[PDB]
Design a protein around this ligand. Structure first.
Ligand SMILES: Nc1ncnc2c1ncn2[C@@H]1O[C@H](COP(=O)(O)OP(=O)(O)O)[C@@H](O)[C@H]1O
Ligand SMILES: [Sr+2]
Ligand SMILES: [Sr+2]
Lengths: 20, 336
């Protein structure tokens, strides 16, 4: 399921900002 | 209303023109614990000796800010935060600096990040997500009327207070601009495609960000996700999005209008402005004046065990504030 794929992804925790 | 912002914009302009400086000093507070850590510093729960009040102190290492070339962005953050005043924006209480760091003392929002509750519960129901979305809608209308673009909406930057209402924090990328800007900044999952494509952009990116937020709250996962940001970027510019089967048709229609790659068709950026959003069907039951006055009963109230309670925040590795005997980058942060 989409949820399954999300929970298995490496971006489920706090997301950091980008500066570039 | 249309004239509430009148008065509002007047108070902002005075504080924007002539900003407050050095309104406290480090020895007035007792540092207690870390609430959230970041790129150039952290946020700690502190306690004001003279009054006994708890606050949230953001500490920025000057040397680190300069290294990552965030001087202008940092000055922006403080200059704007000290000038704004809205029921759903975190209140900046004090600000000052020393040889090594920059400090911003704000009100302490004890409920924790919306992020933490969102991940724990899984997802919020539509009326619950609508409650929170309504608040952002009014805040962005307030912010845009002052020529400010937020640029960093995400559950991690939204705190729930004792009433269950939200307070927007972190103005790291907030900027006052009439026209368009070009900085690639924000958080991957929430970046509008025109930011990625480097076309130059305006306030429309915030409304895009709102579509992503509402989607995440209701689905429990962002519309565009992957393991690596570049992969995420690829997805965003395609605009191809799928909706959970449980999303109401009214919600799907609002999101198709917010998550629109063509600014010419993006809600919030049309002749009717914010009203295209406020008058949408999904918001029909929402009484905007009741939200603003905070009289609506919040659907979720975080558990509170007295002030100075940090139960709603995960734990972090503690560090000791380091203050050099030599002034660091004094000229760069003269206006702070
Ligand atoms: N006024 C506040 N009250 C309570 N917690 C806060 C407050 N401000 C920030 N925090 C916590 O600290 C974290 C980082 O604050 P933030 O301003 O976003 O720092 P950064 O710019 O390093 O990302 C937030 O996600 C939140 O958990
Ligand atoms: Sr942040
Ligand atoms: Sr920031």
């Amino acid at each position: 399921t989409t949820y399954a794929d999300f929970i298995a992804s490496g971006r489920t925790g706090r997301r950091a900002s980008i500066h570039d | 209303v249309k004239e509430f912002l009148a008065k509002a914009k007047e108070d902002f302009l005075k504080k924007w023109e002539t900003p407050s400086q050095n309104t406290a000093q480090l020895d007035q507070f007792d540092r207690i614990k870390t609430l959230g850590t970041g790129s150039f510093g952290r946020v700690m729960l502190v306690k004001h000796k003279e009054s006994g009040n708890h606050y949230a102190m953001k500490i920025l290492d000057k040397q680190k800010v300069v290294k990552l070339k965030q001087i202008e962005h940092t000055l922006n953050e403080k200059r704007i935060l000290q000038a704004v005043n809205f029921p759903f924006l975190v209140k900046l209480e004090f600000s000052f600096k020393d040889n090594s760091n920059l400090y911003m003392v704000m009100e302490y929002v004890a409920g924790g990040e919306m992020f933490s509750h969102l991940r724990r519960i899984g997802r919020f129901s539509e009326p619950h997500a609508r409650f929170y979305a309504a608040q952002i809608v009014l805040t962005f209308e307030y912010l845009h009327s002052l020529d400010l673009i937020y640029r960093d909406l995400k559950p991690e930057n939204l705190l729930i207070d004792q009433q269950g209402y939200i307070q927007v924090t972190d103005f790291g990328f907030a900027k006052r601009v009439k026209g368009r800007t070009w900085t690639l900044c924000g958080t991957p999952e929430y970046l509008a495609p025109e930011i990625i494509l480097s076309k130059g952009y305006n306030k429309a990116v915030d409304w895009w960000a709102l579509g992503v937020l509402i989607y995440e709250m209701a689905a429990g996962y962002p519309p565009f996700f992957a393991d690596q940001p570049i992969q995420i970027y690829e997805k965003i510019v395609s605009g191809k999005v799928r909706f959970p089967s449980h999303f109401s048709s009214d919600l799907k229609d609002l999101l198709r209008n917010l998550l629109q790659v063509d600014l010419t068709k993006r809600f919030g950026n049309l002749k009717n402005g914010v009203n295209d959003i406020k008058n949408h069907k999904w918001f029909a039951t929402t009484d905007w004046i009741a939200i603003y006055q905070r009289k609506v009963e919040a659907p979720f109230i975080p558990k509170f065990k007295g002030p100075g309670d940090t139960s709603n925040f995960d734990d972090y590795e503690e560090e000791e504030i380091r203050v050099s005997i030599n002034e660091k980058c004094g000229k760069e942060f003269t206006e702070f």
